[PDB]
Structures are given as structure tokens and as C-alpha cells.
Symmetry: C2
Subunit: 244 residues, 2 copies
């Protein structure tokens, strides 16, 4: 069974999974893969995940990827509490639905500030003023949508209780926060929901799932960051190259 | 029950759903919403989907969105064949996994040629030469990944049989094709897979699910295209504004 989980806690989807697995007490072998360094691109790793993306979960000789797939798969195999990923047609659908939008509107837009302030400069590459703004006015744009469209009156994006939908959302949101952007400033709805979740999860877990990234801006200043391999350098140039 | 499906067959996710529903014979009330025109933004529609996105499926007073959620939801409620969306842990996982990558790497990159050639100019807005190329070299970049990473030796991205994963993939891919980009040129793997699927689905269905978009380049020429509302004008400028 083994059941190892290659991941880097600077990777927002990685955190999500790690958090889920931890909160439901799932025997997991935490395989650390320095992303900043370019570990996920090491020949040895590509031998595990031809894609070289994190977090990838290896169960048996079955290697899966995609925090969504992994979570869902996990949650299933380990019959985790139902509220998480409900078996109710309407309910599950409500989850499936946000995740899809999340993948569209949240994922990839809220990680940008990290590139603009850390990973970018790390390779001498500086992001254009515009892209920066464009991106932020794009964030709150989504923040709102999330706010009143998904969150609205209820306590969670995916309904009445905590669910994969929240774990993912919040975790992704955490990044710009960690970099200094206080998105929960003028959003008591959002704020309250976050607090509600964190509350649920627990200080301990969150205090450690994050850690890595709240420090990172400093490691950045203190030049503690590893020099990325030419393989990571490439991926990094691409990502930066797809910032609108 | 009603079970209406607002959608515009120029919208690749819309096609997907429509196709699934049609192939499995699901009683569906096809609610057409001119996207090009700006229908999905009409006050009356926002009263149905605060988001104004297509295709949105209204079952009972339950309004759902996200082709993924919809499909899955559909497939469930209408106990459609298992191969589609398997109940097997490894299997389903493999689907869930692609969809996530699909949402990341395919969705949003393969619709661009339509904006560059049609929707864009339709509002006097012309896309920069770079973005164009960047985008295409980005498409085949994904095409390959899809090709040998997901497709590889097996017959489908999601395993051995047709599955939501394919319906969506192929449909999205169809756009640049319909625009004149022959992505299946130097990819016998890709080509064969497509042919495999189309085969399965049937000429009739495909012959009509597409239609709308293979014509569109013409309607474009012949100025048959509806002038978009200031609401659609906005969304159109945003979308174009997020082309890297």
C-alpha cells in the first residue's frame, strides 16, 4: 500500500491535500519535492510522474495527480466523513460545480503575487506593472463572485458544512495573503467564512500547513531560496509567460 | 422536473453536455442562449444563473453550472452507462484527474483562435501577433502532453473506453479545428483517438453538435454575426484582456 504523497507545502494544492489527509488521519508517507529548486523535474521523479507536477499521490503502483482527483480518491478509499464530499446528488453536484469554477476562476490567478514578488525575481525576471494590477483587480473580481455567489448567506462555498470546496479555495487564497495581500480586508463575509473554516480545521494543522509560505517572503529577502535547475527555470519562464 | 438546458452550440462545453445528454437519450429542454449576442447576460437569464455563463442546467428549481458538474450530475441521476463515468476508484480517479488538468491546460487555451479570428474583430478589437503565436505553440504544447501522457498506447485519455474526459477534450479541441487549425495533422495518436471517439458517438450527432461553429468563420465573413450587447461587449473585452 505504501501510500506516499510527494508534495511541497509552498504549493497551494499540495497544502490542501496534505491538510485533508492530516485532518482525517490518513497514513501518509510525505515525500518532499522542492519545487523552487526544481525537484519535481528530476529524472527520478518524472519516472514517478511523467508530468513532473506536485502533489502527486502514489498508492500501490497507482500514481495519481490533481489535488481534486487525489482528494476525492483519498476521501473515497478512506471512507472519510460524508460532509467532506457528500454522496447527495444535489450536494456533491454543488461541490463538483465550485471546483470547476475554482479551476477556472481561482486556480492560477491567486498564485501570481508569488511570481511577481518571489519566484519571478529569483531568476532575474520582473513582471510588468500592468499584469500585476490586471491580476489583482482580477483577484477581487473573483473574490466577490466567490463571496456573494458561492458563499452568500450560507457558511460554506459548497453548502452548509466544510467540504473539499473550502479546503481548496481557502488554501489557494492563502498565498497572496502570505505575500502581504490582505484579501479579507473589506470582506466580512469572506473573512467570517475563512475564520469559520480555520476554526473547524484547527490552529495546529493550519499553523503548520502554511508556515512554509508565510516565511518564504523573508527567505526571499535573505537569499535563502535555492537556485532553480534549468528544468525549473524553463517551467518558471513558461508560467510567467502565461501571465496576462 | 422540466430539465431544461440553456446552451449555445458555439460554446465548446455546451456542445459536450448537449452531446452527452443526446447520446444517452436524456429528455432535455434545449434553452438556446445566443452568446455572441450577449443573451447569457440578459437580466432574465441572470435571474436563472447569477453568473450568466453557459451551459447552465436547470432541473427542478435546482440550477447547476459547469459542464463537469452538469455531466457528472446528469450521468448520475440518469444512471447512464458506467464506462462513461466509472464507479471504480482507480477509474473514476483517472477521469477526475484529466478533467482537472483539462481545466488547467486545455480549457481556456484552445478557444483563443476563435477570439483571434472572430469574436475579437467583431468588436473592432484585434489580438496582438505574439499572443497568437504564444497561444498556438501553447496548444500543441498541450496537445503533446495530452497525446503521449494521457492518450499514450491506450485508446482514451481516461483509460480504455469513452468517458466524460474524452467528450470534453475532443469538443474543446474542435474549436481551433473548426477555425482552420488542423491540430490532428502530425498526431496519428491524437487523430486515431479522435476518429475512435467520433466513430463511437456517431456521424449524425457530431454532424450537428458541431455544425454551428464550422459555419461561424463564414457567418463571420458574411457579417451575419449579431452585434453584442454592452454586457457581452464587456465580458468579451475581459476574456480578450486575459489572453497572455
Amino acid at each position: 500500500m505504501g501510500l506516499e504523497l510527494f508534495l511541497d507545502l509552498v504549493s497551494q494544492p499540495s497544502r490542501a491535500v496534505y491538510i485533508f489527509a492530516k485532518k482525517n488521519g490518513i497514513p501518509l508517507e510525505l515525500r518532499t519535492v522542492d519545487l523552487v529548486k526544481g525537484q519535481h523535474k528530476s529524472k527520478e521523479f518524472l519516472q514517478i510522474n511523467s508530468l513532473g507536477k506536485l502533489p502527486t499521490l502514489k498508492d500501490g503502483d497507482f500514481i495519481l495527480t490533481e489535488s481534486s482527483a487525489i482528494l476525492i480518491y483519498l476521501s473515497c478509499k478512506y471512507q472519510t466523513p460524508d460532509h467532506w464530499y457528500p454522496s447527495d446528488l444535489q450536494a456533491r453536484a454543488r461541490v463538483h460545480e465550485y471546483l470547476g469554477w475554482h479551476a477556472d476562476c481561482i486556480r492560477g490567478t491567486f498564485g501570481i503575487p508569488l511570481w511577481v514578488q518571489v519566484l519571478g525575481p529569483l531568476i532575474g525576471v520582473q513582471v510588468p506593472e500592468e499584469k500585476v494590477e490586471r491580476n489583482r483587480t482580477a483577484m477581487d473580481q473573483a473574490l466577490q463572485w466567490l463571496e456573494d455567489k458561492f458563499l452568500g448567506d450560507r457558511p460554506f462555498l459548497a453548502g452548509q458544512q466544510v467540504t473539499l470546496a473550502d479546503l481548496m479555495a481557502l488554501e489557494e487564497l492563502m498565498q497572496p495573503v502570505a505575500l502581504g495581500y490582505e484579501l479579507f480586508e473589506g470582506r466580512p463575509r469572506l473573512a467570517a467564512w475563512r475564520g469559520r473554516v480555520e476554526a473547524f480545521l484547527g490552529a495546529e494543522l493550519c499553523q503548520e500547513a502554511h508556515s512554509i509560505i508565510l516565511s518564504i517572503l523573508e527567505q526571499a529577502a535573505k537569499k535563502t531560496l535555492p537556485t532553480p535547475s534549468p528544468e525549473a527555470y524553463q517551467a518558471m519562464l513558461l508560467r510567467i509567460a502565461r501571465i496576462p
